[PDB]
């Protein structure tokens, strides 16, 4: 008998594609061989970072009484967190804008 | 016919619906998220490849990915990413 197919993402409990990640690792000329757990680990890490940024962006959207996440919300999420800002320090986000800040010396009186 | 283009749009959308069931996302935001996912994938994969090369190994295993995550992600991001990766690999091996 032949067992029914089950995607490795569901086997690992992930939403991101373990198979696509494994294929990209194999095709990217990163190493001669790729271990079985490497794509699962990488998919899990990518999913974690995506979930973190998306939840922060959603909170930012809620604070602005908005229903959809736009690039401004992604920018606000990233730049209001030291760790994410350090991870994405040399990154430009299109239509993200900048954080509102005015140097204190410029204010009146 | 025309070539099919692959993207992380559907998986990003599933994660968004997991964390924010009622929140939507614009097309430009989804493009930014695709760019972010590709960039982090490239960073981690390159660091893992260099780790394997330095140690004269032909295989990128979960150890290389874990060390790349530790090197790249700062602070508590690294700890939580390592926890998630270890949990995922343990669940995958269990099944």
């Amino acid at each position: 008998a032949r067992a029914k197919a089950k995607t490795r993402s569901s086997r690992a409990g992930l939403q991101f594609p373990v198979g696509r990640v494994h294929r990209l690792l194999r095709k990217g000329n990163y190493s001669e061989r790729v271990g079985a757990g490497a794509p699962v680990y990488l998919a899990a890490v990518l999913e974690y970072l995506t979930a973190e940024i998306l939840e922060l962006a959603g909170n930012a959207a809620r604070d602005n009484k908005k229903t959809r996440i736009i690039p401004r919300h992604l920018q606000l999420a990233i730049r209001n967190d030291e760790e994410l800002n350090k991870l994405l320090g040399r990154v430009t986000i299109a239509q993200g804008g900048v954080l509102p800040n005015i140097q204190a010396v410029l204010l009146p009186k | 016919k025309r070539s099919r283009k692959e993207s992380y749009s559907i998986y990003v959308y599933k994660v968004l619906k997991q964390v924010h069931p009622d929140t939507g996302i614009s097309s430009k935001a989804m493009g930014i998220m695709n760019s972010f996912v590709n960039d982090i994938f490239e960073r981690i994969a390159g660091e893992a490849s260099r780790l394997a090369h330095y140690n004269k190994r032909s295989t990128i295993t979960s150890r290389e990915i874990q060390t790349a995550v530790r090197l790249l992600l700062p602070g508590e991001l690294a700890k939580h990413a390592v926890s998630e990766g270890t949990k995922a690999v343990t669940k995958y091996t269990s099944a």
Epitope: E52, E55, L56, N80, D81, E82, E83 | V19, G75, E76, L77, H80
Partner: single-chain antibody
Framework: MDIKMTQSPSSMHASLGERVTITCKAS??????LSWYQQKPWKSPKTLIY???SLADGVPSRFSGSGSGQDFSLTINNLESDDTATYYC?????????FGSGTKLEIKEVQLQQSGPELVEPGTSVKMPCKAS????????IQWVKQTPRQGLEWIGY????????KYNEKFKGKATLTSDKSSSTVYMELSSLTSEDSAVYYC?????????????WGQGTSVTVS
């Protein structure tokens, strides 16, 4: 509106070696953002479980956390004389963080310096520091918690030294004000117009900006008494 947190076993008794199960229920979904703490009498609480399953640093595997959604539980397998303490569940899935009612159990380097006890007359104001060391100061928020025998633990607010952003509990808005000084690596908690009910013990606790992180290291606490 605020998430009321219910711990069914208000108190319990046990002997050595046997198992214990403490349940904590949420009035709304919090998606596994639950933390468990152990507080010895006259000591700062210590973290046991965070994210409802993860074991905190330095905690033995005797403690086990489980649950998701609105039902959560804490389990201790091999009890010891060291396990005599009060246990609280903390949810931080929504802006006003709510502690559990508490559960009394009896068996038959990061550092946050805090000032000593202070006596103040009603109507004045007090400023209690919280000097932190042993980690990157800007990368972690400093949470503030008020503990009373009547109302138990209550979350006041936090300040993020990275950008000086603050979030206050609606109950303590106006009453409490938070400020930070990056040069001295110190965070200050200001209480205005002291009342009789404001007499309590105030803890400052470190929390990372990460969503699943919890209050991991606590200050010894500053006991404030109002005549």
């Amino acid at each position: 509106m605020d998430i009321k947190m219910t711990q069914s076993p208000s108190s319990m008794h046990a002997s050595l070696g046997e198992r214990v199960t403490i349940t904590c229920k949420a009035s709304q979904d919090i998606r596994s953002y639950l933390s468990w703490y152990q507080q010895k009498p006259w000591k700062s609480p210590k973290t046991l479980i965070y994210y409802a399953t993860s074991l905190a640093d330095g905690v033995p595997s005797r403690f086990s956390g489980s649950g998701s959604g609105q039902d959560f539980s804490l389990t201790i397998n091999n009890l010891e004389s060291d396990d005599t303490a009060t246990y609280y569940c903390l949810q931080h899935g929504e802006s006003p963080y709510t502690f559990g009612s508490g559960t009394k159990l009896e068996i038959k380097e990061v550092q946050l310096q805090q000032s000593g006890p202070e006596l103040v007359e009603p109507g004045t104001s007090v400023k209690m520091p919280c000097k932190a060391s042993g980690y990157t100061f800007t990368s972690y928020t400093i949470q503030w918690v008020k503990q009373t025998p009547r109302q138990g633990l209550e979350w006041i607010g936090y300040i993020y030294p990275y950008n000086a952003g603050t979030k206050y509990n609606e109950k303590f808005k106006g009453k409490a004000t938070l400020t930070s000084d990056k040069s001295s690596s110190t965070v200050y908690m200001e209480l205005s117009s002291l009342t009789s009910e404001d007499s309590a013990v105030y803890y400052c606790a470190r929390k990372s900006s990460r969503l699943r992180s919890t209050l991991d290291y606590w200050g010894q606490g500053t006991s404030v008494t109002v005549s």
